[PDB]
């Protein structure tokens, strides 16, 4: 779904498989974070479904022993001197020795300022130990965490369940059409993006000779040239766009290792899974109720959240017993209206839009000899039409799809292509749609605060600040405290600070709250990007200090006070809201749980073979499963006739479904049901098991 999804699917440790424990035999004992996992496997990232704890991911600094053990780097400390030598240890060595803490207060010389430091013992015990006995130390903070979880800012303030949800739901983000970089993040976005393999990078330094939308020619320092081919609108394995746009001009010089072209979810080289959106934390008229999300129509208008999805269709004209299928315009019992979009050879035109129920590839199959009804004979004699002895089976775009047609890849046996035996013609049609954002779509931040889009309001009827800028999204305040994820609040505050720009006024000394702040951070330009690492980042006092200085937008106006709230005006009624409301720029992503992939309906479709019940799933037509619990509720309701209907004349009564359809069409009463074909099958099976079963009347 994105380079993060690919990268995190690599480095994945699965405990289930051939020779490994199965889920049914997986006791609760193995689904635990043993104290030996620190630095070797992420305690946060793991599937939250039935596979909880059986699937994990490697840590960022973890390394694999030749035997297959997982090593972890460490800096060896000698007589209290933290050296720079890195020694890789496994679980046995780590248990044997005594490890320090990553954020131990070193004296900028190698010594510890305080003799008592935090220590992990052999049994996983955490104690305070004099600095003399310590003989190992973590390489850096955020070593225990994986990549996807290390991409979460303000992780140390989040809980564990919501951090798990955010880490698992950062990998399902879809690639948008712009993919702007996040305002506030961690240092594990550039490395994660350039190590994911979805970004073209110049292998040898040189000067850009020719740049275009399809290829880049880098003129190396020594004579030779090299051309890189971008991937324009290539279909990912999960139906997402995979564009690759260059980010260099015709005269730039690039050094071997520089990012030369963006990927699906990248911006200027680093990672970008979503957009930066203005955020409100007020509950608005019950539309953002119980993890419901309100969106401004500006996102729809300017395509802030608009993804491109590419679906492919495959149809093979294959050999048959009664003849050979051919791909041609001549489709039996069809009109010339639907053939307008079809070219001479049968397939649709490139760039010709398609709608649910259209013709994509015209394929005909030899029908054979079959007796026709006398009424059919009379109609054919009346209208003068011939028998048309071949049957029509053409590739029709399924229910609920639209969009243009990008490209057609057609194989043949006559041009010597490697086709499976029995297949004479194969053709692939790629259909792409520009899906907008809409109600029901799933949105989520980086702290696992998910939610579907309840209602997309117009621009005018949304809360706006004093200067008239309307907010873009409206969360709910009740969902923040009970989920223990104020990391979103801290991210919102820091994002507002980054977007507005700040300047620490050191007229009389540097302020005490910013004493430990690094240089070139006391002042920042508007819309500047920051990077708070995972376990060593911006402190709350520093956040307060930054919010104190929030240099005005265009006029003299500080729209956000010290607390981080603002005066919003109700765009529907007009009066200002009586109390300040928190605002800022949170980073949200569009998840791959779109409505168009979920909505389904059925009136009468295909039926199963052995039993006569309808199929299941959206792939076929299929019907919903009326389970045992639903039957229990139906019974408990004092209800009989609805149960009889749903169990007899809707699923299994072979001579009942046609009768009920005819009665509905003609406007007559619904006929009485019959016994179920499934029950008849059960009776036959029992009789086949040498069990004489006889149903008796009296």
């Amino acid at each position: 779904n994105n380079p993060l999804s690919g990268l995190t699917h690599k480095r994945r440790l699965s405990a289930l498989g051939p020779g490994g424990l199965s889920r049914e035999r997986a006791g609760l004992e193995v689904r635990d974070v043993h104290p030996s996992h620190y630095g070797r496997m992420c305690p946060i990232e793991t599937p939250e479904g039935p596979n909880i704890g059986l699937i994990g991911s490697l840590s960022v600094y973890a390394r694999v022993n030749p035997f297959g053990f997982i090593e972890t780097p460490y800096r060896k400390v000698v007589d209290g001197v933290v050296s720079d030598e890195i020694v890789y240890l496994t679980a046995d060595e780590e248990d044997r020795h005594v490890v320090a803490q990553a954020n131990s207060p070193i004296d900028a010389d190698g010594r510890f300022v305080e003799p008592r430091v935090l220590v992990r013992r052999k049994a996983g015990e955490v104690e305070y130990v004099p600095s003399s006995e310590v003989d190992y130390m973590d390489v850096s903070p955020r070593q225990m965490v994986s990549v996807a979880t290390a991409m979460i800012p303000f992780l140390e303030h989040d809980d564990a369940n919501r951090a798990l949800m955010g880490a698992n739901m950062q990998r399902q983000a879809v690639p948008l059409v712009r993919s702007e970089a996040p305002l506030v993040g961690t240092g594990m976005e550039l490395r994660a993006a350039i190590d994911a393999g979805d970004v073209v990078v110049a292998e040898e330094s040189g000067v850009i000779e020719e740049v275009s939308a399809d290829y880049i020619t880098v003129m190396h320092d020594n004579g030779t040239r090299r051309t890189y081919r971008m991937r324009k609108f290539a279909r990912s394995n999960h139906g997402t766009c995979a564009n690759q746009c260059p980010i260099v001009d015709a005269g730039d010089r690039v050094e071997a290792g520089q990012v030369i072209a963006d990927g699906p979810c990248t911006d200027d080289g680093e990672m970008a899974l979503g957009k930066n959106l203005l955020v409100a934390i007020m509950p608005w008229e019950g539309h953002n109720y119980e993890d419901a999300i309100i969106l401004s129509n500006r996102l729809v208008e300017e395509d802030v959240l608009t993804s491109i999805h590419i679906e492919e269709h495959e149809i093979d004209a294959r050999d048959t017993k009664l003849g050979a299928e051919e791909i041609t315009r001549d489709i039996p019992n069809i009109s010339d209206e639907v053939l307008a979009d079809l070219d001479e050879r049968g397939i649709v035109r490139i760039g010709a839009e398609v709608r649910d129920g259209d013709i994509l590839v015209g394929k005909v199959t030899p029908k054979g000899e079959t007796e026709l009804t006398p009424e059919e004979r009379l109609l054919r004699a009346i209208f003068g039409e011939k028998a048309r002895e071949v049957r029509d089976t053409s590739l029709k775009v399924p229910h609920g799809e639209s969009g243009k047609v990008i490209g057609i890849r057609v194989f043949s046996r006559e041009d010597e292509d490697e086709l499976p035996a029995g297949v004479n013609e194969l053709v692939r049609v790629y259909v792409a749609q520009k899906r907008k954002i809409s109600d029901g779509d799933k949105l989520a931040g980086r702290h696992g605060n998910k939610g579907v889009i309840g209602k997309i309001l117009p621009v005018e009827d949304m809360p706006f600040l004093a200067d008239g800028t309307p907010v873009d999204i409206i969360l709910n305040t009740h969902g923040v405290p009970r989920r223990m994820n104020i990391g979103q609040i801290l991210e919102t505050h820091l994002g507002w600070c980054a977007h507005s720009g700040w300047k620490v006024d050191a007229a009389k000394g540097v302020p005490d709250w910013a004493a430990r702040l690094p240089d070139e951070l006391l002042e920042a330009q508007p819309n500047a990007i920051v990077s708070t690492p995972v376990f060593d980042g911006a402190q709350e006092a520093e956040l307060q200090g930054l919010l104190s200085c929030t240099l005005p937008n265009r006029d003299g106006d500080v729209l956000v006070d010290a607390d981080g709230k603002a005066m919003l005006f109700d765009g529907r009624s007009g009066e200002p809201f009586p109390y300040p409301v928190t605002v800022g720029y949170m980073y949200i992503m569009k998840l791959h749980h779109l409505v168009d992939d979920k909505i389904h309906a059925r009136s009468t479709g295909p039926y199963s073979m052995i039993t006569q019940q309808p199929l299941g799933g959206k792939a076929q037509f299929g019907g919903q499963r009326f389970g045992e619990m639903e039957c229990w509720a139906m019974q408990a309701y004092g209800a009989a006739y609805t149960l009889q209907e749903l169990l007899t004349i809707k699923s299994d009564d072979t001579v009942g479904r046609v009768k009920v359809y005819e009665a509905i069409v003609k406007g007559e009463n619904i006929p009485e049901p019959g016994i179920p074909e499934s029950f008849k099958v059960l009776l036959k099976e029992l009789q086949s098991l040498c069990l004489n079963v006889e149903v008796l009347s009296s």
Binding site: I86, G185, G187, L190, A256
Partner: peptide, 21 residues
């Protein structure tokens, strides 16, 4: 740093790290 075309993303990190990813 350590990436030639890395955009200037100012960091809040307090302590240096010896080992790169």
């Amino acid at each position: 740093n350590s990436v030639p075309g890395a955009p200037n993303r100012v960091s809040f990190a307090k302590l240096r790290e010896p080992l790169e990813v």
